[PDB]
């Protein structure tokens, strides 16, 4: 009989539930947003589940045929709830839905701020593996048997399983993690852990950007120079480089390294030859900087392989090619887009041996396109040295007037 | 009923304006003419066109005027400056034209010399070197001259000749050519040798105001007395009745010229221009010259460029949806910084984005940029002469925000005329007066209109505030041509 692993992912604003095969094919897709910084636990719960059946609705299966369930999340978020390591209130979800269904894991926990990364245990006056059937549930009687958080799991569904495998996911911004394999250390990083299965544990680092992809929704909303966010491949393409023209969009302040939140926003080398193509190219460019910046981070600690992306703007050919260019390794784009659910039903089927092994997965992972780097070293230590300067111009800009 | 006939010979189009003695226009002809690129980076003039432009410029006023020619009391002289112009023994170019943007020439080491002899820093703006270039690199030339057969003349100097016979120039146009001392108020022997410059093509200097000769018959019908001649920008210094030291007059376009009134003071800037302002009555009236490459081109560039506006007049009403810049400058540095930083490695920039920042915040820091880019010159010009007021012209003048945040930063008043044609203006001023068509320079001012005057209204600490986030992105903005 034809079994599929049900997978949940109940992300901040939209609860998603997909069914995947062997092959990670989807079979059936539900999704549901929710009102938001605080969510009601209630109206999380309804849309997570009107995404359930409408996964099996649309996947035209009977209940008895899911051989599992993983769950991914919104990591942080407290349990109306509040909503999302050096401290922050920054630092859960998984858990209100497996006994909704029936815990956490050492990735989701790692999160909390309350549980040691290096001893693997529980002031502020107040845990299974990834991978293992935490309990059932009680109608079909499936098991629940995956949970990671979410940046964890798309880690995990991009078969990142070796150190140096780079995940980057471009949205409103950026979540990039590499895995240790290695319990490491940075001031400009975070350190948490990617999952624990078969008894081993899985260390990653972590790097965040503020404004990524939303510097490209400021050229469609801000200026409104274009309309479409994929409009900027093919005015980047119109031209054979930045021609001196560069974009620090830092509408909130620069991150890591240079940890400067004053700094704003600036285009700089405009003559009276810049033009819309100029502003598109050097938006993307700069999310291929600002990339670079944590990924660099990251080769002083471990050797950094190659980058796996996902998110929506992983879809610009421009960008992903200038991406390698820069970074001088491969970028690599996956067929699947949903890394997140797919990373969570990864963990949930190897609990019940629906996959074998993890090589077996990382056997059968198929990428979309792989990204080749074109691009000498001269050129790049150029380019970047390009960006450099201009990040420096930018910098305490907030001190200087009153906003 | 008499009027005074107005030639300003602009560098791409050619007016002519009658006047009465309100400043009234009753008449206008204008007439572009072609601009000849022939190398890279060179323009040219052929003087037959410019001749013939305002030639029907010319009758185009006075068909428009609806008066008869013997109604001319006057005609006045006014011309894009420095441009250079070789003619034989009877009016026909041996050459065309060198414009004052042809960069043939583009020594200084061996220099300053130059600089307190003339007022102007060296450089191929200025006609001797074209003057040196046109007797250098033509058949005929140079050989012509040590045996007087040419003559030669900035722009207002070959239109005088071809109305009148007789061969002169002005001490504010004479003071632009490089050649002549403008202290002395001669040639100067020395600046001749520099450039081996034959005496005998040389116009006699004469001042601004008086009558040089009368026109034929034949050419307008009457013989009209030829009576005034400055350069086009101390002409508009004149329209503008800026007659006291101290009063300014900012041209806003593509680019700005800015010039200030220090009368009888010759007086020396590291950032500025020393130059005539003009010559009346035995009188010589000096000024300070600066001047800004970009200003309404970063208006051009918000249209053209980037696409924000479909016309510059849109860039206020954008610009007035905000009560203040709310951290956002431009520093419209296309082609590098001039005064006081001089940096032809600066770059445009952009800076204090956020994801709020919008059309308004670009079209407001374009036109704060402006401002800003003017005050700069003026405080330069602030250290040797005491500032009065800004009196206006140019397209941009009628940009209310613009104005109005121009009088706030400068802590000034902004003095926007009703006749804008200010070139053409005082030329008649400088001829009317020289035939008694005005009685005296006070009767001039006397009957000046303005259309409208901006006064400050911005309280100093924000005025300071505001320049220094200015100073704050300038310094941001330099030396990033070497970057890449």
Redesign the interface.
Known sequence: MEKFVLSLDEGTTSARAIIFDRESNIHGIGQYEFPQVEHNPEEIWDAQLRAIKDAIQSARIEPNQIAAIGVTNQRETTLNAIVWLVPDAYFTVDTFLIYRLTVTDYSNASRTMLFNIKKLDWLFDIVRESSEVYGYTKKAEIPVSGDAGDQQAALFGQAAFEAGMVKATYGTGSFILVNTDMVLYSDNLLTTIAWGLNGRVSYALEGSIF?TG?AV??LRD????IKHASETEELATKLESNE?VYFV????GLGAPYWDQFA?????????????EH?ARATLEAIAYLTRDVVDEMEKLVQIKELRVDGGATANDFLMQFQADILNRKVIRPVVKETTALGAAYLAGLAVDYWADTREIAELWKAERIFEPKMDEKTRE?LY??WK?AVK??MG??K????
């Open positions: 404004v939303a929704q400021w801000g200026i409104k120079i001196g969009p830092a509408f909130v704003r926003g600036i285009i700089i080398g405009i003559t009276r030859g810049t033009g819309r502003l150029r040295k390009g300067e111009r930018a800009w907030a200087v007037v009153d906003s």
